[PDB]
Ligand binder design. Structure first.
Ligand SMILES: NC(=O)C1=CN([C@@H]2O[C@H](COP(=O)(O)OP(=O)(O)OC[C@H]3O[C@@H](n4cnc5c(N)ncnc54)[C@H](OP(=O)(O)O)[C@@H]3O)[C@@H](O)[C@H]2O)C=CC1
Ligand SMILES: NC(=O)C1=CN([C@@H]2O[C@H](COP(=O)(O)OP(=O)(O)OC[C@H]3O[C@@H](n4cnc5c(N)ncnc54)[C@H](OP(=O)(O)O)[C@@H]3O)[C@@H](O)[C@H]2O)C=CC1
Ligand SMILES: N[C@@H](CCCCN[C@@H](CCC(=O)O)C(=O)O)C(=O)O
Ligand SMILES: N[C@@H](CCCCN[C@@H](CCC(=O)O)C(=O)O)C(=O)O
Lengths: 449, 449
């Protein structure tokens, strides 16, 4: 029985998924709104078919979904609920590398009634991080140990040698997704109590986070970690934090953008016209003139800087992006998306450059015999150089786990119905085994103290 | 006329030199005290012959030197004068990748009278750094520009992903050489005036040095840079500094070892006996007991720490080295060498790991038209993974330049007699050309401001 999969999306993390599936003899229809993008991804790939499809078209989506055994939603997570509803009425399975949101979880019973499996959070973060966090936690518990502290930090960044731009950041996955993640309020456990961080004040929490001597990482909380007390079954943990890693200087730069209104997704009439960046910025920052001096004067009066050195650096970075120039904007209605169009222009990985994925779990453990130790679980991988034809570390670590999950749902290895995530050794072990043995993907443990 | 070369040494940087020369049809005799070491390096290498030879034996040295056209001194630099005296008697050329010291310079006229060329400072640093520092300086001057500031920083370190040990450092070249360099007094130009740093206080001058967002580099002055005002012909420079790069935390750790006397090369009777580290450390630090508590007590009272966190870190690192344990020391007479034996034991690169060479020149320029700009010349290279059979970045960037120089002295490309260094475009250009076009070795320029 030849299997067939509908892959929604042809972006950053899709090629590895397409490769793994077609290399298994599974037919894959690659679908997104821009036919050309779908063709480019599937060009030369055996068993693949490119088509144009907008998930907003219910009739069109249902007709295509009905032609396959399962749908992979590798598109903006805002669309997952819609995709699941289509899969439910067509009785087809679903796989995503996104968080299970309340909207998605609401469809759990309906999914079960339709007898379908909606497997989520099986990319890098969320995904691989869950697999190895749970692996260690269950091991410790089985040994009568206690997890007093659970930390999990991850960052998809450019390799240090390829990080030379004002932001120390280049895109390896959804550009707008990156900006959206920069506004997420966070919550976590510290010294046994819940600590909250409001979205608009996320960057200010950034602190240097030491992993290895050679890296200059800074970190900030990632979304709400408190539910993991129950999700990972670690009620004894006083500290529980899932965080994000960036390079020195990044958060301060973002903070300024947030403070002057550049991460606002509020529709502005003036942002639908291709006006010069000078003017767009003037309106966004609310400066009295499109002059660089006036714009900067307003920005400095409304932003925070750790020092005059920082201020000089960030302002020069903003200028580098071209927001003070005559170059016309790519009108996208709101500041966030309009800025995003220019970021996509200037922060792309170039020939010969590579990305880097750093993922590290840290466990403060209290052994059964009252003894204490510190354990780390790490994954540090560089992507293949641009122009080599190889995968970036991000695409590999997201797309491969995704493909493995798809194959498991198709062959019944993952058989629970409803809206799921990698939260049971029943499916986590098989996932880890395949990723390790067949692809060399794994987190390595080590006792640090 | 088949050329023959006597390569003294078979350590870290020799394999690339041996490979390049023998691949050129040049016969090479690999010589050092330990016959097995010479054999291991030349095993399977065409045109190579391994022998045991101690440069301290004048008669044996002259006899061997006389059989070749040129001698490469890839051994501790304390031996260069001795090697050159032998080369002078035998009228043979010499090449080293070491600094021209006063002792070596004293032999300049005798070398000239013997008609031989003694080419030095043609490794990575000193070496490649000289080549590209001069290249840019002469370009700017030819354009009527002024070099107001000249900075040159270089570090041979483990790649960030391979830097996971208490020191953030692993050996890629002479272990004791590394330690010796940590005690060198420094001097440089700052704001038009000479600034001196005493050897014992070198580590305290370390400051974060920004190059790329991803790296966490710290830097300190490297030896006396003041002579370069004349050496590089930049009398108009207000700031002139040649420095070294290490990773965050390294200098503070070394500072402690220096303060408690671990970098002393004073012969101690008790350090000639394979006693437990506990005891050795006790005597060296002068603690009232071999107890971990007493030793640490003495250390904390005699060392400096930026914070209690730092103190905890460094003490844990020292314990990691095992100087508080029962393990017997490898008796080497003095603290520096005795400690070195243990460092060599614990700080070696392991399977799959790799080093990193970061070299960057920075020039603050004042153009002819009064305009100003900042230029950087960079080289950032990772070494082949251990076990791959490839060269480390250090071995490649030291050994290849050395081999090219040897070939140039042999065919006459470098013909000036006496004690030399890469200080003239006459020989620097050919050196850079060959290294760039044949091996892809070069520093890339860029205007930063
Ligand atoms: N778990 C993890 O660790 C990670 C998860 N992800 C998740 O993976 C998903 C995809 O990420 P990534 O590949 O980087 O995304 P990209 O932004 O690169 O690509 C998104 C793709 O979705 C398509 N798309 C957008 N809107 C529609 C629509 N209305 N109908 C059909 N297709 C549409 C695009 O279509 P079009 O061609 O028409 O523009 C495009 O091909 C996201 O949900 C992201 O958050 C990403 C990285 C890591
Ligand atoms: N310019 C640059 O950028 C760099 C320059 N260097 C310089 O290169 C030289 C070699 O460095 P590296 O390869 O790392 O050194 P290692 O410490 O790895 O090896 C030194 C070698 O010299 C040999 N040796 C020591 N004493 C004697 C002796 N009495 N007679 C004969 N041989 C002896 C050793 O001999 P044995 O087998 O008997 O023990 C060993 O093979 C040094 O002077 C170093 O400072 C190094 C790195 C970079
Ligand atoms: N947290 C790291 C790793 C990137 C993981 C990206 N995953 C997306 C998932 C969004 C979704 O589809 O639900 C994210 O925003 O965390 C970093 O930011 O560098
Ligand atoms: N300065 C860098 C690069 C190491 C180059 C080592 N060269 C030796 C040369 C000694 C000699 O033979 O004269 C040095 O000590 O700088 C670093 O320290 O990491």
């Amino acid at each position: 029985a030849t299997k067939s999969v509908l892959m929604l999306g042809s972006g950053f993390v899709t090629r590895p998924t397409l490769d793994v599936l077609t290399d298994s003899g599974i037919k894959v229809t690659v679908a997104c709104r821009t036919l050309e993008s779908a063709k480019k991804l599937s060009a030369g790939v055996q068993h693949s078919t490119p088509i144009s499809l907008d998930v907003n078209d219910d009739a069109a989506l249902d007709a295509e979904v009905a032609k396959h055994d399962l749908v992979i939603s590798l598109i903006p997570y805002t669309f997952h609920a819609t995709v699941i509803k289509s899969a439910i009425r067509q009785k087809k399975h679903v796989v995503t590398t996104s968080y299970v949101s309340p909207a998605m979880m609401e469809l759990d019973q309906a999914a079960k009634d339709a007898g379908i499996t909606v497997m989520n959070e099986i990319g890098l973060d969320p995904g691989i991080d869950h697999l190895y966090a749970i692996k260690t936690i269950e091991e410790v518990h089985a040994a009568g140990g206690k997890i007093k502290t659970f930390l999990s930090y991850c960052g998809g960044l450019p390799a240090p040698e390829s990080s030379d731009n004002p932001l120390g950041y280049k895109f390896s996955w959804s550009s707008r997704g990156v900006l959206l993640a920069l506004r997420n309020a966070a919550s976590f456990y510290k010294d046994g109590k819940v600590t909250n961080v409001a979205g608009p004040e996320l960057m200010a929490t950034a602190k240097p986070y030491f992993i290895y001597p050679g890296f200059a990482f800074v970190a900030y909380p990632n979304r709400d970690s408190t539910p993991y007390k129950e999700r990972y079954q670690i009620p004894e943990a006083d500290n529980i934090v899932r965080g994000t890693l960036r390079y020195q200087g990044f958060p301060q730069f973002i903070k300024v953008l947030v403070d002057i209104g550049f991460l606002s997704d509020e529709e502005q009439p003036f942002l639908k016209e291709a006006i010069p960046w000078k003017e767009a910025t003037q309106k966004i920052v609310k400066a009295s003139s499109a002059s660089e001096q006036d714009i900067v004067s307003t920005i400095v009066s409304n932003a925070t800087f750790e020092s005059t050195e920082e201020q000089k650096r960030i302002v020069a970075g903003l200028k580098w992006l071209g927001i003070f120039s005559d170059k016309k904007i790519t009108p996208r209605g709101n500041a966030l998306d309009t800025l995003c169009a220019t970021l996509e222009e200037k922060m792309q990985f170039e020939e010969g450059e590579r990305d880097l994925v750093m993922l590290q779990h840290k466990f403060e453990i209290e052994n059964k015999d009252g003894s204490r130790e510190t354990r780390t679980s790490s994954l540090c991988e560089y992507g293949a150089p641009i122009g080599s034809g190889g995968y970036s570390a991000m695409a590999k670590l997201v797309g491969v786990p995704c493909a493995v999950a798809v194959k498991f749902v198709l062959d019944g290895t993952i058989s629970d119905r409803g809206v799921l995530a990698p939260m049971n050794s029943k499916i986590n072990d098989p996932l880890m085994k395949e990723l390790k043995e067949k692809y060399g993907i794994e987190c390595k443990e080590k006792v640090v103290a």
